[PDB]
Design an enzyme around this catalytic site. Structure first.
Site, mmCIF file in Angstrom:
data_model
loop_
_atom_site.group_PDB
_atom_site.id
_atom_site.type_symbol
_atom_site.label_atom_id
_atom_site.label_comp_id
_atom_site.label_asym_id
_atom_site.label_seq_id
_atom_site.Cartn_x
_atom_site.Cartn_y
_atom_site.Cartn_z
ATOM 1 N N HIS A 205 34.170 -15.138 -148.472
ATOM 2 C CA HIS A 205 35.605 -15.312 -148.373
ATOM 3 C C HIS A 205 36.167 -15.796 -149.696
ATOM 4 C CE1 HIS A 205 36.432 -19.832 -147.458
ATOM 5 N NE2 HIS A 205 35.246 -19.738 -148.030
ATOM 6 N N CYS B 24 37.306 -22.791 -152.448
ATOM 7 C CA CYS B 24 36.170 -23.207 -151.650
ATOM 8 C C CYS B 24 34.988 -23.372 -152.582
ATOM 9 C CB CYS B 24 35.852 -22.183 -150.570
ATOM 10 S SG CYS B 24 34.480 -22.561 -149.477
ATOM 11 N N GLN C 9 35.961 -22.318 -138.042
ATOM 12 C CA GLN C 9 37.303 -22.372 -137.476
ATOM 13 C C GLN C 9 37.591 -21.083 -136.725
ATOM 14 O OE1 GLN C 9 38.886 -24.271 -141.494
ATOM 15 N NE2 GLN C 9 40.083 -24.663 -139.635
ATOM 16 N N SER D 91 42.252 -24.702 -143.152
ATOM 17 C CA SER D 91 41.872 -24.877 -144.558
ATOM 18 C C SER D 91 42.851 -24.218 -145.506
ATOM 19 C CB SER D 91 40.484 -24.320 -144.867
ATOM 20 O OG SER D 91 39.571 -24.634 -143.851
ATOM 21 N N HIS E 219 42.608 -17.180 -146.047
ATOM 22 C CA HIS E 219 41.349 -16.527 -146.381
ATOM 23 C C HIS E 219 41.513 -15.015 -146.480
ATOM 24 C CE1 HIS E 219 39.296 -20.260 -144.959
ATOM 25 N NE2 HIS E 219 40.239 -20.240 -144.036
#
Ligand SMILES: NCCOc1ccccc1
Length: 147
Positions: A43, A97, A115, A138, A141
Protein backbone atom coordinates in the site's frame (compact mmCIF):
# COMPACT_ATOMS: atom_id res chain seq x y z
CA UNK A 1 -23.74 -10.42 -12.71
CA UNK A 2 -20.29 -9.06 -11.85
CA UNK A 3 -17.56 -9.94 -9.29
CA UNK A 4 -18.03 -8.83 -5.64
CA UNK A 5 -18.72 -5.10 -5.38
CA UNK A 6 -18.67 -4.12 -9.08
CA UNK A 7 -21.42 -2.02 -10.67
CA UNK A 8 -21.94 -0.27 -14.01
CA UNK A 9 -21.69 3.47 -14.41
CA UNK A 10 -21.54 6.08 -17.16
CA UNK A 11 -18.72 8.51 -17.77
CA UNK A 12 -19.95 12.06 -17.33
CA UNK A 13 -17.47 13.34 -19.89
CA UNK A 14 -17.68 10.64 -22.58
CA UNK A 15 -20.99 8.84 -22.20
CA UNK A 16 -19.14 5.53 -22.27
CA UNK A 17 -20.06 2.85 -19.74
CA UNK A 18 -17.40 1.99 -17.21
CA UNK A 19 -17.22 -0.22 -14.12
CA UNK A 20 -16.77 0.84 -10.52
CA UNK A 21 -16.17 -1.26 -7.39
CA UNK A 22 -17.67 0.18 -4.21
CA UNK A 23 -15.44 -1.95 -1.95
CA UNK A 24 -12.04 -1.16 -3.52
CA UNK A 25 -13.08 2.15 -5.20
CA UNK A 26 -11.44 0.94 -8.41
CA UNK A 27 -12.78 2.12 -11.73
CA UNK A 28 -12.07 0.81 -15.22
CA UNK A 29 -13.51 0.81 -18.73
CA UNK A 30 -13.26 -2.95 -19.20
CA UNK A 31 -15.79 -5.42 -17.73
CA UNK A 32 -14.26 -6.96 -14.57
CA UNK A 33 -12.68 -10.40 -15.00
CA UNK A 34 -14.77 -13.47 -14.04
CA UNK A 35 -12.21 -16.13 -1.17
CA UNK A 36 -8.70 -17.07 0.01
CA UNK A 37 -7.67 -17.48 3.63
CA UNK A 38 -4.93 -14.89 3.18
CA UNK A 39 -3.96 -12.16 0.72
CA UNK A 40 -0.71 -10.26 0.37
CA UNK A 41 -0.84 -6.53 -0.32
CA UNK A 42 1.32 -3.46 -0.66
CA UNK A 43 0.00 0.00 0.00
CA UNK A 44 0.77 3.67 -0.28
CA UNK A 45 -0.62 5.66 2.63
CA UNK A 46 -1.19 9.39 2.58
CA UNK A 47 -1.94 10.60 6.09
CA UNK A 48 -3.82 13.76 6.99
CA UNK A 49 -4.43 15.90 10.06
CA UNK A 50 -7.30 13.68 11.24
CA UNK A 51 -5.24 10.49 10.96
CA UNK A 52 -5.18 8.41 14.15
CA UNK A 53 -1.47 9.31 14.41
CA UNK A 54 -0.77 12.44 12.34
CA UNK A 55 2.95 11.61 12.13
CA UNK A 56 5.22 9.55 9.87
CA UNK A 57 8.86 9.00 8.90
CA UNK A 58 8.34 11.68 6.23
CA UNK A 59 6.93 14.37 8.54
CA UNK A 60 6.98 14.77 12.31
CA UNK A 61 3.70 16.73 12.23
CA UNK A 62 1.38 15.85 9.33
CA UNK A 63 -0.75 18.95 8.79
CA UNK A 64 -2.35 18.37 5.38
CA UNK A 65 -6.13 18.18 5.10
CA UNK A 66 -8.03 15.04 4.15
CA UNK A 67 -8.96 16.78 0.87
CA UNK A 68 -5.30 17.50 0.18
CA UNK A 69 -4.34 13.90 1.03
CA UNK A 70 -7.02 12.69 -1.39
CA UNK A 71 -5.62 14.91 -4.14
CA UNK A 72 -2.17 13.41 -3.56
CA UNK A 73 -3.63 9.87 -3.70
CA UNK A 74 -5.48 10.82 -6.89
CA UNK A 75 -2.25 12.10 -8.45
CA UNK A 76 -0.34 8.93 -7.54
CA UNK A 77 -3.07 6.75 -9.05
CA UNK A 78 -2.97 8.80 -12.25
CA UNK A 79 0.80 8.38 -12.60
CA UNK A 80 0.62 4.67 -11.80
CA UNK A 81 -2.15 4.04 -14.31
CA UNK A 82 -0.31 6.06 -16.96
CA UNK A 83 2.87 4.06 -16.32
CA UNK A 84 4.76 7.29 -15.68
CA UNK A 85 5.61 5.95 -12.23
CA UNK A 86 5.57 2.54 -10.60
CA UNK A 87 3.50 1.84 -7.51
CA UNK A 88 6.58 0.56 -5.70
CA UNK A 89 8.50 3.71 -6.56
CA UNK A 90 5.79 6.08 -5.32
CA UNK A 91 5.20 4.02 -2.17
CA UNK A 92 8.91 4.05 -1.27
CA UNK A 93 9.11 7.79 -1.81
CA UNK A 94 5.78 9.03 -0.47
CA UNK A 95 3.93 6.52 1.71
CA UNK A 96 3.39 7.78 5.25
CA UNK A 97 3.76 4.19 6.46
CA UNK A 98 6.90 2.52 7.73
CA UNK A 99 6.24 -0.10 5.03
CA UNK A 100 7.59 2.51 2.60
CA UNK A 101 11.04 1.08 3.26
CA UNK A 102 9.73 -2.26 1.83
CA UNK A 103 8.21 -0.64 -1.30
CA UNK A 104 4.87 -0.70 0.52
CA UNK A 105 4.71 -4.45 1.12
CA UNK A 106 2.74 -5.45 4.23
CA UNK A 107 3.14 -9.18 3.88
CA UNK A 108 0.32 -11.67 3.93
CA UNK A 109 -2.61 -11.36 6.30
CA UNK A 110 -5.99 -12.79 7.21
CA UNK A 111 -9.36 -11.29 7.87
CA UNK A 112 -9.45 -9.74 11.33
CA UNK A 113 -5.94 -8.26 11.38
CA UNK A 114 -6.30 -4.99 9.45
CA UNK A 115 -8.65 -2.04 9.61
CA UNK A 116 -11.93 -3.12 8.10
CA UNK A 117 -12.04 -0.84 5.00
CA UNK A 118 -8.50 -1.91 4.15
CA UNK A 119 -9.29 -5.59 4.75
CA UNK A 120 -12.46 -5.50 2.65
CA UNK A 121 -10.69 -3.79 -0.23
CA UNK A 122 -7.69 -6.11 -0.01
CA UNK A 123 -9.85 -9.23 -0.23
CA UNK A 124 -12.10 -7.86 -2.99
CA UNK A 125 -9.05 -7.12 -5.16
CA UNK A 126 -8.03 -9.82 -7.57
CA UNK A 127 -4.37 -10.81 -7.66
CA UNK A 128 -2.49 -8.02 -9.43
CA UNK A 129 -5.31 -5.47 -9.13
CA UNK A 130 -4.97 -2.03 -7.54
CA UNK A 131 -7.57 -0.18 -5.50
CA UNK A 132 -8.79 3.35 -5.73
CA UNK A 133 -8.59 5.56 -2.66
CA UNK A 134 -9.43 3.50 0.44
CA UNK A 135 -10.24 5.39 3.64
CA UNK A 136 -9.32 4.22 7.15
CA UNK A 137 -8.51 5.85 10.47
CA UNK A 138 -4.87 5.89 9.32
CA UNK A 139 -5.51 7.99 6.25
CA UNK A 140 -6.01 7.26 2.56
CA UNK A 141 -4.54 4.12 0.95
CA UNK A 142 -3.77 2.87 -2.51
CA UNK A 143 -3.76 -0.93 -2.22
CA UNK A 144 -2.02 -3.38 -4.52
CA UNK A 145 -2.87 -7.04 -4.00
CA UNK A 146 0.24 -9.01 -4.87
CA UNK A 147 -0.86 -12.51 -3.79
N1 LIG B 1 -0.53 15.58 -12.80
C1 LIG B 1 -0.65 15.90 -14.31
C2 LIG B 1 -2.09 16.26 -14.63
O1 LIG B 1 -2.82 14.99 -14.65
C3 LIG B 1 -4.19 15.01 -14.54
C4 LIG B 1 -4.41 13.62 -14.64
C5 LIG B 1 -5.73 13.20 -14.55
C6 LIG B 1 -6.81 14.06 -14.37
C7 LIG B 1 -6.60 15.42 -14.26
C8 LIG B 1 -5.28 15.88 -14.32
Amino acid sequence: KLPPGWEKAMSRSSGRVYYFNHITNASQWERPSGEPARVRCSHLLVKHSQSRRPSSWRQEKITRTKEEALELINGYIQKIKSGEEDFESLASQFSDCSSAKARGDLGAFSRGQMQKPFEDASFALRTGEMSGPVFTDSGIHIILRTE
